[PDB]
């Protein structure tokens, strides 16, 4: 039962969590570059993060 | 896709179009024309306006 208890208490066919991410700070440098096209990649990574 | 971003940003131009310069300067000639005319009245009615002051 202890063998068995500890086979199934582990979940090899799911995902880990990854480590969380801070808040990004973009910086002023890249914002004075790119101030309208941020938000779009910003939204294009949530959106590959979460599908791709 | 930030790479073609920056590339795109300094590649892009001041203006969201293609202007077609030919029509502008039409434009422009017409109306430096019509502006030279109305000024040239606007001075025939000023002498009126100061020989009745």
Do not use: C, M
């Not at chain 1, 086979?7 to 090899?12: E, F, I, M, P």
């Not at chain 2, 896709?1 to 017409?30: C, G, I, K, S």
């Amino acid at each position: 039962a202890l063998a068995k208890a500890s086979a199934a208490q582990v979940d090899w066919t799911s995902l880990p969590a990854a480590p969380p991410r801070p808040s990004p700070s973009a910086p002023d440098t890249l914002i004075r570059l790119l101030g309208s096209v941020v938000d779009d990649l910003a939204d294009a990574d949530k959106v590959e993060q979460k599908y791709g | 896709r930030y790479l073609t971003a920056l590339v795109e940003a300094e590649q892009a131009p001041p203006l969201p179009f293609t202007p077609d310069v030919l029509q502008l300067q039409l434009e422009h000639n017409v109306l430096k024309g019509e502006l030279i005319d109305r000024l040239r009245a606007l001075e025939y009615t000023i002498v009126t306006e100061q020989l009745q002051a």
